[PDB]
Design a protein around this ligand. Structure first.
Ligand code: HEM
Ligand code: HEM
Ligand code: HEM
Lengths: 155, 155, 155, 155, 155, 155, 155
């Protein structure tokens, strides 16, 4: 089925954001498990896999709309060097991708592409859940301290 | 454990090649399923997952050697538009990726990094298996014809 | 027990024929799997294993008759290069092996070695089944075409 | 995939050695069971099956490298007449194949055919285990005597 | 069904041989058990039971052909007094019973009594198996010694 | 099978290092469990068991090569007094045996003792994993503090 | 809990004896399995493991008494060249072990370290059982001969 060109452009932009998130989250997850923080590494790995599933869904939607997925464009990775830094980098990545999803949802509503809007709404809910988790982790770091928090992530 | 810098550079080169393969294979797999070729799409998806696991193993090895994985650089993907074309593109990608693995194995032998050598040997064996599969598919296309071959890829 | 010398000579001749068949069928089976023809490869592998069991049975019979099995002699191998050629080579070998079995059965009747005749009768019944299968495959090739036939051997 | 011609030659030579071992070990196994020595016959049969699997692996590797396996050439078998001679013949045959395997592994190292090196290394370890077993049996014959040794091989 | 009179005579002769075998083998088995050689006694008992089944089959075949089974004639038993002697006696009986079976099979072929020929062929195969076992046991005695051999027959 | 004398010398040196590691790790595990740090005690116990298996494998290889294992010589023991000190002592011991394994692997490659090279390669991989765990533990001590770290080792 | 210094000295001496026994028994077990003597190898392996558990118990007891286990010093190792000689060496080691255990038990009685006496009593009973087994094996060698004895150790 032929889709709207601007809808395909929005889907490609979201796909590029998801591609950035996949690499950033996987590298963060692997650097967490390297330091012995199995809990944080496992959670970041699960979030990365969720990002891969989001990218797969976007690729399927673009292909159904007779568009061309853009896997080539990989943007800047926001990689941190310590646990707090990587948590803030992940939160900033999540926040920076939120306006794009909202704009895509609004445009899909405006031109009557309701299935794409439903898919983007599911993606937006997932991104909001990740944002909530990251903010909760940072607040916990503030409440209990860095050492206690890092101890809680040991196992 | 501190590793050799040149070994880190070789591992980063292989990791970049693996990322290229991941993106190209996932795109080809999802374009196969869109055409109704479930079998070819499933095999391409499995190949992409294997490339993902190779990239994960390389990232783990680089992080163990106190290096910095380079996931930021994504090179040119060889994306095809018809089944024969994308099979040939995958074959070209695999053939181009072989010399880097062999050079990395030779260097690991030279400097005595034997665990990295075993890792790269496993990766090389997997790449050779994929090459064998791709060549078998192309020869089967030449033997039984494109129309017969594409029919067997349904379901 | 001590058997007839000429019976042992006939058994040795059939054993050499079976060894030739083992080698040819195993090579054909392996080059079938390499091309991607799983069905033909599996059937040729099973036929090869049947030839191996026949050779083992002949070795046991020769040993019981206080003779020396002759595994040193390996004659000409009729190795084909394309599927039809392989099938015709196997059929030609199987047809050339038949007169020796019939002559040996007749001789075992002449001198009253009835257990050896029963063994050779079982072997001959198996060889006739292999001939029937090969002829059926060639007739199917001539009936449905080479490309259609090769597609059915993919899986 | 096209491999090195000299690597294919080494693989073919090792395949011929494996075929010789297959024939010799099967004949020895069968003449062991004829004497009532079930244990020695069973172990020789298992060794012959292992040699068959080695030959199969070599055939597959040669086929992958786009070469022609040489099943035609079968060299001299080292057949014994009593148990001690059979064991010494098997040990001599196994020790005469180690230099070929070692040279092939060294050459595969030289030209960077690492998958072939891994295959040859696996079969070399198997041959070394067979040599260990043969030497242990020959030393046990001298430790406990021929009559005591043959009695333990009955059941 | 009315059979051929000479076929009935041959069957009666074979039955008379089978009865002698039954008695001799049962007696040998019982003295083997009495001496404490449970393994040899068990094998001899099984051999006697097999001869018993052969006699039963012969009686059934004679009765089907409207003939009169002759169980009255019991000829001389070859009873031994030590293990080697009774193994040799069994071998002598089994070898002396062979020409009658072969002559009966030849006559059944000549007159066209094919079912009787199949029965006698099965009997002949069994007798050959017993001959093989007896010769193997005697060769084992000559190879490992009487004292070692008898120790293996305790259980 | 007779092996190279220098290869046996290298294996003997590695075996002595393994025995040193066995004794030191067992003592460290016992004092860890004595202080009430069950997790550290359990991991040190498992590491000591792994060292025991390494020593067993080396002894088997030396005996197969017709050499004489040197269990008599046991070198100095790097015994620590506190958790940080014993972790550092274990890391130093593991780093001080790595060059020996690397030199042994290089020599086994040079003279063609490939099975010994594979055994030493497996041992080297195990020692590298132990080094990774020890460095991770020390970095975790630095990250979360000694008091927090020791609390997590209680259960 | 603080214990007597002399009790700790006795425990350390017993621990050194146990370490000597561990090394000697493991080496003897390995060469027993190398020669093909599975029964003797398995029993020596189990005896060695029992010695390891004895040493572990002694280490725990020394650590509980707030002492310092002496794992460093490894004394003479009575290694034999043939089965009879190694059995005599093991018996000599076990017999030389006894007086130290008896003196330690008597001293623990004298100063009222009753738990240590119970531990040493269990160890003494185990050593007495090993002595009984070793003397039984030597008496069996005398009764049935070396060649007959070694045959029973094959499997
Ligand atoms: C640096 C890049 C990537 C790495 C290191 C990576 C790694 C992985 C790993 C280790 C798995 C686990 C496989 C398993 O457990 O069987 C996985 C699963 C998966 N990945 Fe990736 N991946 C990457 C990029 C991508 C991309 C770009 C996509 C899609 C556009 C993708 C799609 C998937 C899917 C669909 C799965 C399976 C999900 C499931 O089984 O439920 N991945 N990946
Ligand atoms: C004198 C020559 C040979 C004899 C008498 C012989 C005999 C046998 C027998 C009796 C079996 C057992 C099959 C079963 O139990 O199902 C067997 C298995 C096998 N043979 Fe041989 N064989 C010979 C040569 C070869 C050769 C030349 C090859 C390959 C080049 C080969 C490859 C195999 C394989 C792959 C198996 C199956 C192993 C398995 O299923 O685990 N054999 N052979
Ligand atoms: C010096 C050379 C040594 C060698 C070659 C050796 C070898 C072994 C082996 C092969 C095992 C079997 C592990 C398993 O089956 O999972 C084992 C277990 C064990 N070893 Fe070591 N060991 C040595 C020294 C020691 C020492 C010095 C001690 C104590 C002071 C010790 C204590 C133990 C214990 C407690 C076990 C567990 C046994 C069980 O769980 O049943 N070992 N050893």
């Amino acid at each position: 089925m032929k889709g709207d060109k601007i809808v395909i452009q929005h889907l490609n932009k979201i796909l590029g954001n998801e591609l950035i998130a996949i690499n950033q989250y996987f590298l963060h997850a692997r650097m967490y498990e390297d330091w012995g923080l199995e809990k944080l590494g496992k959670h970041e790995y699960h979030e990365s896999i969720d990002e891969m599933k989001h990218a797969d869904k976007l690729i399927k939607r673009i292909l159904f709309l007779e568009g061309l997925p853009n896997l080539q464009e990989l943007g800047k990775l926001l990689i941190g060097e310590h646990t707090k830094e990587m948590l803030e980098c992940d939160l900033k990545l999540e926040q920076a991708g939120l306006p794009d999803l909202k704009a895509a949802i609004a445009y899909c509503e405006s031109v009557g592409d309701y299935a794409s809007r439903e898919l983007l709404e599911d993606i937006l809910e997932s991104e909001e859940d990740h944002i909530d988790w990251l903010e909760t982790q940072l607040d916990l770091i503030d409440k209990i301290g860095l050492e206690n928090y890092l101890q809680s992530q040991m196992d």
